[PDB]
Design an enzyme around this catalytic site. Structure first.
Site, PDB file in Angstrom:
ATOM      1  N   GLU A  35       6.833  -5.265   1.013  1.00  0.00           N
ATOM      2  CA  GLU A  35       6.015  -4.241   1.642  1.00  0.00           C
ATOM      3  C   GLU A  35       4.543  -4.634   1.672  1.00  0.00           C
ATOM      4  O   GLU A  35       3.892  -4.415   2.681  1.00  0.00           O
ATOM      5  CB  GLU A  35       6.181  -2.897   0.946  1.00  0.00           C
ATOM      6  CG  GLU A  35       7.557  -2.230   1.159  1.00  0.00           C
ATOM      7  CD  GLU A  35       7.794  -1.732   2.561  1.00  0.00           C
ATOM      8  OE1 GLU A  35       6.813  -1.752   3.371  1.00  0.00           O
ATOM      9  OE2 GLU A  35       8.949  -1.389   2.870  1.00  0.00           O
ATOM     10  N   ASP A  52       0.593   3.338   6.701  1.00  0.00           N
ATOM     11  CA  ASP A  52       1.256   3.071   5.433  1.00  0.00           C
ATOM     12  C   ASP A  52       0.217   2.512   4.458  1.00  0.00           C
ATOM     13  O   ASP A  52      -0.591   1.643   4.800  1.00  0.00           O
ATOM     14  CB  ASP A  52       2.353   2.018   5.612  1.00  0.00           C
ATOM     15  CG  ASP A  52       3.422   2.440   6.528  1.00  0.00           C
ATOM     16  OD1 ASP A  52       3.723   3.612   6.649  1.00  0.00           O
ATOM     17  OD2 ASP A  52       4.031   1.553   7.107  1.00  0.00           O
TER      18      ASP A  52
END
Ligand SMILES: [Cl-]
Ligand SMILES: [Cl-]
Ligand code: NA
Length: 129
Positions: A35, A52
């Site tokens: 991520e 994000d």
């Protein structure tokens, strides 16, 4: 802050993620690697206008407030900037809510596509835990 692999594993363990909802520690380390590359300051904008944030790339449409995602929720009750801190507490506490929401770790696309079904214990191998 850019964590080392074993340093992040130890921090995640101290904050209660090992086997949280049945997901062993290597799952969480693997998710963070893909991520964010272990960088707490990572941000990525999505097509829908959400962003994000942080080591686990938590999304502003549902989980945190960034002031620029109309119609969104803030289910972790935090500003998204708190997710960029060198202290991972806010990210871990929010991730515990996410993983409890019904789809488990499938909420993290990089986990589903790059960690799920692999030998995730490799991510904690050699670490003093
Ligand atoms: Cl690594
Ligand atoms: Cl599950
Ligand atoms: Na939001």
């Amino acid at each position: 802050k850019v964590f080392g692999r074993c340093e992040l594993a130890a921090a995640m363990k101290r904050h209660g993620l090992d086997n949280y909802r049945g997901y062993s520690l290597g799952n969480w380390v693997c998710a963070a690697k893909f991520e964010s590359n272990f960088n707490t300051q990572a941000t990525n904008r999505n097509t829908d206008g959400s962003t994000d944030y942080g080591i686990l790339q938590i999304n502003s449409r549902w989980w945190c407030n960034d002031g620029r995602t109309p119609g969104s929720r803030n289910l972790c009750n935090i500003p998204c900037s708190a997710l960029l801190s060198s202290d991972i507490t806010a990210s871990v506490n929010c991730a515990k809510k996410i993983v409890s929401d019904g789809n488990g770790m499938n909420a993290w696309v990089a986990w589903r596509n790059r960690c799920k079904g692999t030998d995730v214990q490799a991510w904690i191998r050699g670490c003093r835990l």
